[PDB]
Design brief:
6 copies of one chain form a homohexamer. By secondary structure, chain A is mainly β. The first copy, chain A, is built from no helices and 10 strands. The PDB classes it as protein fibril.
Amino acid sequence: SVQIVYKPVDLSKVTSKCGSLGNIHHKPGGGQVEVKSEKLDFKDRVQSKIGSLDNITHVPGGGNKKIETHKLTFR
Amino acid sequence: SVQIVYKPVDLSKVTSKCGSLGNIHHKPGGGQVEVKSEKLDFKDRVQSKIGSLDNITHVPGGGNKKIETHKLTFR
Amino acid sequence: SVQIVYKPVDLSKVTSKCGSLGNIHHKPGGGQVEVKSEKLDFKDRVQSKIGSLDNITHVPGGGNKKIETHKLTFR
Amino acid sequence: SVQIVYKPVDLSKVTSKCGSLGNIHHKPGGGQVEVKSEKLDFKDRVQSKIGSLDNITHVPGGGNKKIETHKLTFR
Amino acid sequence: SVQIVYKPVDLSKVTSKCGSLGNIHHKPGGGQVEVKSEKLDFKDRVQSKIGSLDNITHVPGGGNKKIETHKLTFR
Amino acid sequence: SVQIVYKPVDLSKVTSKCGSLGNIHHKPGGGQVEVKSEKLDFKDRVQSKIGSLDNITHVPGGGNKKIETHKLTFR
């Protein structure tokens, strides 16, 4: 016969302390953007993005990550 | 025969402390954007984005993440 | 017969302290951008980005990451 | 005695020809402009301009200038 | 006695010809502009200009200049 | 007695010819501009200019200049 005991344990801690957070600035695309196009031929699919796109400012007062996995397998 | 005891345990903790949060600025796309197009031929599908799109400001007072998985498998 | 005991333990800690966080600046694409195009032939898919795209400012008041995995297998 | 005869003459001509005039662009101040001030003391007059001021576009189909003077003087 | 005779002449011509004029571009201040000031003391007059100012685009289809002066002076 | 005769003559011609004029670009101040100041004392007048000022684009389709003077003087 076979007997299996599986009891792993976690009690872990993650933390931050800050006296103050501030005076934070992000200014993507401050300059002029220009595009000019003539006589182009396209014979297959086209995708275009122009200007100030997808820019992120991300200022979490704290932000932390855990990942865990368990896979007990018989045959 | 086969007998299995599977009782994993987690008590883990996540935190932040901030005395004050403020004076945070995001100003994407401050400059002029311009596009001019002449005599283009397209013979298949087109997508276009122009200007200030999809920009994000994300300022959570705290924001944290856990992922966990268990996959106990017999045959 | 076979008997298996699997009971690892974690009590770990991760931390940060800051007296104050501030006066932080990010300014990508401060200069002028220009593109000019004539008489191009495309016989293939086309993908284009112009300007200030995807810039990230990421200012976590504290930020930490941990990953764990367990794989106990019989045959 | 004294006698004076003063009979100057001008018959001069000024001209332009243009077959067509067009596609003229002026774009002053295409980028973002920013000013920040703290704890300034002024004990006399202040004058200030900020932004896009006094810019000129001047496209006369023709534009020409003549100046003339006559100063006939006795004693 | 004294006699003075003053009878100068001008018959002159000034000209331009152009078959076409165009595709002219001026873009002063395409980039971002920034100013920051702290704790400044002024005890006399102040003048300030910031940004894109006084810029000129001048495209006369023809433009020409004549100046003339006559100064007959007795004693 | 005294007699004075002043009778000069001018017949001049001045010209330009162009088959076509175009594709002219002027782009001053394409890059980012920045100024930072702390704890300055002024006991005297101040004048300041920052950014893209006084830039000229000057494209006369034809452009010509002439100056003349006549000065007849007695004693």
